[PDB]
Design a protein around this ligand. Structure first.
Ligand SMILES: CN1CCN(c2ccc3[nH]c(-c4c(N)c5c(F)cccc5[nH]c4=O)nc3c2)CC1
Ligand SMILES: [Cl-]
Ligand SMILES: [Cl-]
Ligand SMILES: [Cl-]
Length: 295
């Protein structure tokens, strides 16, 4: 019935915020995700406005779309909070369309953030900064892994950056039918998501923490190329042939042998032999400390 659900959503007082406390703003992504101001999110501080992102359905959406948004909200409740993931902040579920209120990242996704900061052909990033960005993403993933969550689409596009340059993993709670994914469908930027997938996920559709580590390897490569496009110009069929032959991307120019070996370890052909996010956090912590910020 238009945008009204055939079913009705159960109340959850742990998370419910009155609709009139949410001042809706401009679109951020599509859909749909919109910037809003939330008044009195914290019940201790009722006079404060907090900038938040709000997920909601488009007028087109079906009961299945609603079901998927409810599922993401419920998984976010279960997973709990961490500094390096996008956290659930509240919901409006009653007497109107479902709003899922989550953290706002004012500097947008990591791919654009990195690209905007390439030297001109915007302040440049030091080696330490790039390695700290990798560190934070690995910490977010270590948390998610510890909570038994497999992301399935880890990539710079799904990492968001806050006003204080905190990296936050986004979209870890999405319901996806991996049988139905279009290998030829592209991101809005025109790149192919198959280029982040482990061979076992790609060929046999087996998704594991180990396949997420493969994706993290590609993400590391994205970071040290300042937002480079993996396997540029390569179509799906040729990607499959490259992976069956054991091809691996070349070492980026602005990158140490140790970090490249980390990337290659993430792309181990045998999944059991890849490092764990726990180990990656440990190795990256040591490297951050030993890497120069120039000065
Ligand atoms: C100066 N500035 C440049 C970066 N600018 C920007 C652009 C797009 C942006 N998207 C989000 C965002 C999400 N797309 C998002 C999601 F898809 C799921 C869950 C939470 C989310 N939180 C967000 O904050 N922030 C953005 C900032 C706008 C202004
Ligand atoms: Cl509906
Ligand atoms: Cl918590
Ligand atoms: Cl991308």
């Amino acid at each position: 019935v238009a945008g009204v659900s055939e079913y009705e959503l159960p109340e959850d007082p742990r998370w419910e915020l009155p609709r009139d406390r949410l001042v809706l703003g401009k679109p951020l992504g599509e859909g749909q995700v919109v910037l809003a101001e939330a008044i009195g999110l914290d019940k201790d501080k009722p006079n404060r406005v907090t900038k938040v992102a709000v997920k909601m359905l488009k007028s087109d959406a079906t009961e299945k779309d609603l079901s998927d948004l409810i599922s993401e909200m419920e998984m976010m409740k279960m997973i709990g909070k961490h500094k390096n993931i996008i956290n659930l902040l509240g919901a409006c579920t009653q007497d109107g369309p479902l709003y899922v209120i989550v953290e706002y990242a004012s500097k947008g996704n990591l791919r654009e953030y990195l690209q905007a900061r390439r030297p001109p052909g915007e302040e440049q990033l030091s080696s330490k900064d790039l390695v700290s960005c990798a560190y934070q993403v690995a910490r977010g993933m270590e948390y998610l892994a510890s909570k038994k969550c497999i992301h399935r689409d880890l990539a710079a596009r799904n990492v968001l950056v806050t006003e204080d340059n905190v990296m936050k993993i986004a979209d870890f709670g999405l319901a996806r039918d991996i049988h139905h994914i279009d290998y030829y469908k592209k991101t809005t930027n025109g790149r192919l998501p198959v280029k982040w997938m482990a061979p076992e996920a790609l060929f046999d559709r087996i998704y594991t923490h180990q396949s997420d580590v493969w994706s993290f390897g590609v993400l590391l490569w994205e970071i040290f190329t300042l937002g480079g496009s993996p396997y540029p110009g390569v179509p799906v069929e040729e990607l499959f042939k490259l992976l069956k032959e054991g091809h691996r991307m070349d070492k980026p120019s602005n990158c140490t042998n140790e970090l490249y070996m980390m990337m290659r370890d993430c792309w181990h052909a045998v999944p059991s032999q890849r490092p764990t996010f726990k180990q990656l956090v440990e190795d990256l912590d040591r490297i951050v400390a030993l890497t120069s910020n120039q000065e």
